[PDB]
Amino acid sequence: PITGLVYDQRMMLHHNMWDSHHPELPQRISRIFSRHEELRLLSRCHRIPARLATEEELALCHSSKHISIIKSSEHMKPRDLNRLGDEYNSIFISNESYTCALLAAGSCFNSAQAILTGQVRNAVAIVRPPGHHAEKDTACGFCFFNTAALTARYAQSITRESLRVLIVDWDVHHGNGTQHIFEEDDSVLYISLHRYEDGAFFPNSEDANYDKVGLGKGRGYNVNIPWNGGKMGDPEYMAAFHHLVMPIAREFAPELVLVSAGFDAARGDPLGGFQVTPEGYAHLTHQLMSLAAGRVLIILEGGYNLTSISESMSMCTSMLLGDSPPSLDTPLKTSATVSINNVLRAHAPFWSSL
Ligand SMILES: O=C(NO)c1cc(F)cc(F)c1
Ligand SMILES: [K+]
Ligand SMILES: [K+]
Numbered sequence: 001p002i003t004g005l006v007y008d009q010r011m012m013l014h015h016n017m018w019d020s021h022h023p024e025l026p027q028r029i030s031r032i033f034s035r036h037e038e039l040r041l042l043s044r045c046h047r048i049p050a051r052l053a054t055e056e057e058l059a060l061c062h063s064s065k066h067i068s069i070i071k072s073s074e075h076m077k078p079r080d081l082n083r084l085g086d087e088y089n090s091i092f093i094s095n096e097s098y099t100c101a102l103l104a105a106g107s108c109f110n111s112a113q114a115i116l117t118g119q120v121r122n123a124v125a126i127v128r129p130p131g132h133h134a135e136k137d138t139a140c141g142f143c144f145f146n147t148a149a150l151t152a153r154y155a156q157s158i159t160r161e162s163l164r165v166l167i168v169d170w171d172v173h174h175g176n177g178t179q180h181i182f183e184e185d186d187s188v189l190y191i192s193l194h195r196y197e198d199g200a201f202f203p204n205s206e207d208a209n210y211d212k213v214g215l216g217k218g219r220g221y222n223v224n225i226p227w228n229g230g231k232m233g234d235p236e237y238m239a240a241f242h243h244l245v246m247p248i249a250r251e252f253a254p255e256l257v258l259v260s261a262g263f264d265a266a267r268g269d270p271l272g273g274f275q276v277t278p279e280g281y282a283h284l285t286h287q288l289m290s291l292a293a294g295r296v297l298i299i300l301e302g303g304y305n306l307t308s309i310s311e312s313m314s315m316c317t318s319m320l321l322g323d324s325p326p327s328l329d330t331p332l333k334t335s336a337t338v339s340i341n342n343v344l345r346a347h348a349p350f351w352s353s354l
């Protein structure tokens with residue numbers, strides 16, 4: 001009954017050479033690791049080594065054009081780095097960026113392999129840069145390659161091609177890249193909760209609305225839970241899990257659960273504006289461990305208050321290790337009930353549990 005953990009200090013080398021205070025900080029991952037030490041969680045986990053993703057692995061989800069462009073940045077002078085980064089939506093690049101993106105992905109491949117070979121029951125991946133905004137053909141939103149999407153395809157590649165993978169994306173932003181990569185796929189169920197605000201919140205696309213349910217064979221296998229009207233917290237997230245995430249996931253019966261675990265919906269985040277607590281994230285984790293015989297891999301995405309993300313991710317690891325869920329502390333905001341009922345109207349056609 002083992003929990004795995006992957007962390008590698010080399011992923012701190014990716015950095016913003018114009019703005020040392022850009023919130024996607026190198027210390028995001030060292031702070032989370034340090035808090036695991038302080039809580040004596042690290043010695044309770046089995047350390048999984050990081051590795052580089054290969055180019056063939058990246059091609060499970062990304063075009064050769066995109067792979068080639070990001071790879072070429074490793075050798076670019078600052079002028080071309082600043083210029084290349086400015087061509088994407090919200091990207092900075094250093095000469096170390098490509099390597100760190102490869103390590104983030106390969107770390108998650110090794111973690112998924114450890115779970116699927118029975119070496120650990122579940123795992124946490126403390127990685128950066130994030131992945132869920134990255135598309136097949138372009139970088140976006142601090143993300144170069146789509147780590148979670150690649151990990152789902154990697155998992156299928158070492159088991160069977162149709163392995164049922166659930167990706168629950170609780171980062172406060174919509175994972176536009178993960179949705180698009182699997183939009184026509186019934187083997188990977190994508191469920192995202194995200195601040196939407198009728199399309200005004202990053203990444204600023206109505207692709208994130210509840211009526212986008214999937215295409216072709218994938219009809220019904222894309223579940224967007226969009227929040228509108230300000231602050232959301234534990235009551236809203238627990239309601240969404242009760243009414244939507246868990247009934248759907250149980251019917252899908254995944255063989256592996258990946259969490260796109262951004263912690264920017266957390267109380268204190270400078271960018272999310274929400275107030276999910278560390279106890280709230282622990283309860284979401286504990287609920288997902290009831291799926292896939294416990295085979296859950298928690299993958300860091302966003303989250304920018306260093307104290308908040310360190311406390312929140314550590315509580316998730318405590319749940320994976322089998323600790324009892326903490327106590328929670330309110331009626332739902334009206335608009336949250338509106339959002340949940342809209343998703344039920346969108347997905348009741350596809351799920352007999354709805
Ligand atoms: O990746 C992100 N959050 O987890 C992110 C990406 C952006 F382009 C902007 C932002 F404020 C946040
Ligand atoms: K999300
Ligand atoms: K899908």
Ligand SMILES: [Zn+2]
Nearest residue numbers: 171173264302
């Ligand atoms: Zn985010």
